[PDB]
C-alpha cells in the first residue's frame, strides 16, 4: 500500500461520500497487529462516484491511517466515526491505498 493525503471540504447537509468499514471496539483491538496486507482497522467499503471523496482520489479498499491529525490505525469503528463527525465540513485524511 502507498500513502496519500486527501483534504475533503463539503457543505453542511451533504456527506463526504464514502462508507467506512471495520471492527468495533468490542473486538480486542488491543491485540491488533498491523501487517502490510491489513495495515489499519478501518477501511473504505465504498466511495460515491458523485461525491467529495471520489474527487479527492479516494477509492474502495483504502485503509484509514489518520483523521485530522489523530492516528486511527488501532481505533475502533464508532470512535473513528466520531472523530470524522467532529470535524464538521472538513476532513483531513491520510490513507494507504493499492495505487
Amino acid at each position: 500500500y502507498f500513502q496519500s493525503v486527501a483534504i475533503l471540504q463539503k457543505r453542511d447537509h451533504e456527506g463526504f461520500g464514502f462508507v467506512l468499514r471495520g471492527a468495533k471496539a468490542e473486538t480486542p483491538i488491543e491485540e491488533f497487529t498491523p501487517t502490510p496486507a491489513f495495515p489499519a482497522l478501518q477501511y473504505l467499503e465504498s466511495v460515491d462516484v458523485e461525491g467529495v471523496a471520489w474527487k479527492a482520489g479516494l477509492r474502495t479498499g483504502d485503509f484509514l491511517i489518520e483523521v485530522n491529525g489523530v492516528n486511527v490505525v488501532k481505533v475502533g469503528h464508532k470512535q473513528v466515526v466520531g472523530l470524522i463527525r467532529q470535524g464538521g465540513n472538513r476532513l483531513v485524511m491520510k490513507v494507504v491505498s493499492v495505487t
Binding site: 456527506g15 463526504f16 471495520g22
Partner: peptide, 6 residues
Amino acid sequence: IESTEI
C-alpha cells in the same frame, strides 16, 4: 465488523 455512511 460495522459499516457507516460518511
